[PDB]
Every structure is written in structure tokens, then in C-alpha cells.
């Protein structure tokens, strides 16, 4: 509908959105970004990597308009003062995730459909290069940085044409907890339920 149901992080999730989490429905940017926000909230706890998530508009914008077009999006946050940078990626009718881990010192792309996109990682490393200059006025040290993409046999793949967003989210969930990705397609239906919960509650079970 239009009726707001839950709300935080200066965001508002409505019934229309929550419904996208339903059975086999394609999730929308509202769910992804809200969920991503909860992960960044939880990242405050000790024992967890500090995390910063960009909204699902950043990468596309950064890819089609260049750095000069998103440089001000990070005006109130020092990207390099966190451990993990979450980059949800929208590919028109499919969802993906790119993750910058300054600790492991590498940029890895995650696709539940087996795609590769190492280009996405190059775009991001370039980004890190422009930020380090625009914001910290020094030149980024790429030494040791690994740009790669997880292979279909390395991470749980989806078996339908809808859970892409779900995998993206859960991948980040596990990644943000420094825990091995240990779920499968079989869990998706549950995960969807647990999220309409977690979101209306604003708390990650």
C-alpha cells in the first residue's frame, strides 16, 4: 500500500516494500538498504568489524557518471576508518554484492548466480583511489589488494529467479559477522520470513 510500518535510520519501510519480501517476490531497494542499515548498526558491537554500507544507488551512479558524481556522498563519513565497506549492486533485474575489506585487504564480488564482474572490483579499487585523494589528500596504497570474484562453487547459489536480493543480504549478514557463509537455497523461504520480522522489529535476530 503506502502505510508506513517500521522505520529507523531515517528511513521508512512501507507495506508495499515489506510485501516484496513475500513468497518469490523480487525485493526492492527499500528492503536491501534497510537491511543493510541494520548490519551497519550491529557493526557497532565489540567483536564485530566496523561496517559502512553505501545505498543501492551509489555503484550504478559511480559506474555511469564517474567518481566526480558520487564524491560528495561520503561527505560525513571516513570510508577508510571502517573495516568493511558494503556495496549492494543493482543489475536491473538482479542483485549483487561487492565487499571492501580493508583488513583482508581485498575487494570481492558476490553473485548468487555465478556471474563474475571483476570489473566491478576494478571500479571500486579506482574509487578507493579517488577517495584517498579527495578526502585524506594522500595516495591510496594498493599494495596487497586483491580484486576477485567468488565462483559459483564457493558460495551458495540460488535455484530460482527471485532470491538474488535475499542472498545478497544474507551474504553480507554472514560476512559482517566474520562467520563462514553457511546457508543454502533451502533456507531462503525462512530467511524471508525472519526478515519481515527483523525489519518490522528493527532488530537482527
Amino acid at each position: 500500500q503506502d502505510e508506513v510500518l517500521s522505520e529507523a535510520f531515517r528511513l521508512t519501510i512501507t507495506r508495499k516494500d515489506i510485501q516484496t519480501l513475500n513468497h518469490l517476490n523480487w525485493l526492492n531497494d527499500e528492503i536491501i538498504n534497510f537491511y543493510m542499515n541494520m548490519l551497519m548498526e550491529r557493526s557497532k558491537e565489540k567483536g564485530l568489524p566496523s561496517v559502512h554500507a553505501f545505498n543501492t544507488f551509489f555503484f550504478t551512479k559511480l559506474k555511469t557518471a564517474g567518481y566526480q558524481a558520487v564524491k560528495r556522498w561520503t561527505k560525513k563519513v571516513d570510508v577508510f576508518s571502517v573495516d568493511i565497506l558494503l556495496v549492494p549492486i543493482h543489475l536491473g533485474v538482479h542483485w549483487c554484492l561487492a565487499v571492501v575489506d580493508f583488513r583482508k585487504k581485498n575487494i570481492t564480488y558476490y553473485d548468487s548466480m555465478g556471474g563474475i564482474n571483476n570489473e566491478a572490483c576494478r571500479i571500486l579499487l579506482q574509487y578507493l583511489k579517488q577517495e584517498s585523494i579527495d578526502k585524506k589528500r594522500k595516495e591510496f596504497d594498493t599494495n596487497g589488494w586483491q580484486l576477485f570474484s567468488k565462483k559459483s562453487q564457493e558460495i551458495p547459489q540460488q535455484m530460482n529467479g527471485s532470491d538474488s536480493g535475499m542472498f545478497a543480504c544474507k551474504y553480507a549478514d554472514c560476512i559482517t559477522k566474520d562467520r563462514p557463509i553457511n546457508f543454502t537455497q533451502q533456507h531462503m523461504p525462512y530467511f524471508r520470513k525472519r526478515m519481515v520480522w527483523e525489519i518490522l522489529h528493527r532488530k537482527l535476530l
Partner: protein, 78 residues
């Protein structure tokens, strides 16, 4: 006082608004959607990458004279 805002779209069409610093942008957003004839939950209003909420004010966001508000559309994927 007042601030001059420019709400731009992907098509680069720009709508101008004259708003007052200490005022909820929920209207500017509501006006825009009307001039476009689309439901509120159809667009997202970002100021320098930041999502503009109903109870957001140019003063809080620190918007300046002649600033831009970019409008994005809903993204979905399977």
C-alpha cells in the same frame, strides 16, 4: 531565511523549489511527485547521496543556496 533548491531527475529535467531552512521537505517531495503524477513510494529523494525523509529540513541536512536534490526510481531484482 529561504533557500533555492533544484530537484533533478535521470532525464535531467529540473524542477525548482523555494523552501525555508526550518521546514519539513515532506511537501517538496509531495509536490514533486504530483508534478510527475506518481505515488510517493515510487521515487527516492537523495541530497548528496543521502536519503531525504519526510521530517528532514535543509538546515539539518546543511543544504545551501542553489543546491541539488537527485531523484531516483525504485530498483527491484530477482
Amino acid at each position: 531565511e529561504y533557500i533555492k533548491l533544484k530537484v533533478i531527475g535521470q532525464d535531467s529535467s529540473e524542477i525548482h523549489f523555494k523552501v525555508k531552512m526550518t521546514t519539513h521537505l515532506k511537501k517538496l517531495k509531495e509536490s514533486y511527485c504530483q508534478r510527475q503524477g506518481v505515488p510517493m513510494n515510487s521515487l527516492r529523494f537523495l541530497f548528496e547521496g543521502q536519503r531525504i525523509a519526510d521530517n528532514h529540513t535543509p538546515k539539518e541536512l546543511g543544504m545551501e543556496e542553489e543546491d541539488v536534490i537527485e531523484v531516483y526510481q525504485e530498483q527491484t531484482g530477482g
